């Protein structure tokens, strides 16, 4: 709380004023339903491990000190998270999608939720701003990946009393865009699994830059259908797994 030295132009401080610019953010929803046979386990937020192929964090990128012809790079690699919890492990893997700095989970009954998304301006973290051209381009290449399994880690949970940071973006019904890539799930530990995504300005919707996707998995029954995922889960029960 001390100190006070802080500008205001920083995207982390507040929204930008550059008309042709809007901080695009991602926000996925995941309502996992356990099968009536999998032992009890509400120890969500067990752990999370971020990874980025080649992108790493400094600037090596495999360190290919030997050119010849190869130039597959071009597009940025992929970032995945191993958020373990709820007796299950949900592996992510987004590519060319806004950075995700918000991770939270919760357990209610024989089901467990998980909210992954970016932070909205004036929160305390970064908030990269971009033009409409760079945005429209991203929303097209942005592709998510999912691969849930069956965990048994009885280890305790590691949460943070710090409220969950939202992307200020809703989950209403908007334009449809194919973002969700592959979705493999070992039903052996997941009866029903719903998914909802939506990338758009976390400061003020812009329709065009607003889109969404989502399917409905119920006992092997998969089906695409845009719907108001505003209540798909109680965002008030989400706790940061840090």
């Amino acid at each position: 709380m001390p100190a006070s030295l802080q500008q205001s132009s920083s995207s982390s401080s507040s929204c930008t004023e550059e008309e042709n610019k809007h901080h695009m953010g991602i926000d996925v929803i995941i309502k996992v339903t356990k099968q009536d046979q999998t032992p009890t386990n509400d120890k969500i937020c067990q752990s999370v491990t971020e990874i980025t192929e080649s992108e790493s964090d400094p600037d090596p990128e495999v360190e290919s000190e030997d050119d010849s012809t190869s130039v597959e790079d071009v597009d940025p690699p992929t970032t995945y998270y191993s958020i373990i919890g709820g007796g299950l492990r949900m592996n992510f893997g987004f590519t060319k999608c806004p950075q995700i700095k918000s991770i939270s989970e919760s357990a209610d009954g024989n089901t467990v939720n998980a909210r992954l998304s970016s932070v909205s301006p004036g929160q305390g973290k970064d908030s990269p701003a971009i033009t409409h051209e760079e945005a429209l381009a991203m929303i097209k290449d942005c592709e998510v990946s999912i691969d849930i399994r069956c965990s048994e880690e009885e280890k305790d949970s590691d949460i943070k009393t710090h409220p969950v940071l939202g992307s200020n973006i809703s989950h209403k019904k908007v334009s449809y865009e194919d973002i969700i890539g592959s979705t493999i799930v070992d039903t052996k530990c997941v009866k029903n699994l719903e998914f909802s995504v939506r990338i758009g300005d976390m400061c003020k919707e812009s329709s065009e830059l607003e889109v969404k996707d989502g399917f409905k998995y119920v006992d092997g029954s998969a089906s695409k259908g845009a719907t108001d995922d505003t209540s798909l889960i109680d965002s008030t029960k989400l706790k940061a797994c840090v």
Partner: protein, 69 residues
């Protein structure tokens, strides 16, 4: 070793729109058959597994390449 009743399944429902260059693909595996709509699944380095529609020649060539080396 009595086989299980009717084990659910692990078939693909959707494919990735972006083809991940070989560099990020060291192995692969095929879905199953209990689903009248299978597909080819490729492994990576920092992810796990991701389905791929075999309708794209690049996917067929990627498999053929992994078959040799």
């Amino acid at each position: 070793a009595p086989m299980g009743s009717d084990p659910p399944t692990a078939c693909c429902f959707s494919y990735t729109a972006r083809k991940l260059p070989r560099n990020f693909v060291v192995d692969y595996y095929e879905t199953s058959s209990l689903c009248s709509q299978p597909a080819v699944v490729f492994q990576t380095a920092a992810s796990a597994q991701v389905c791929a529609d075999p309708s794209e020649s690049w996917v067929q060539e990627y498999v053929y390449d992994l078959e040799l080396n």
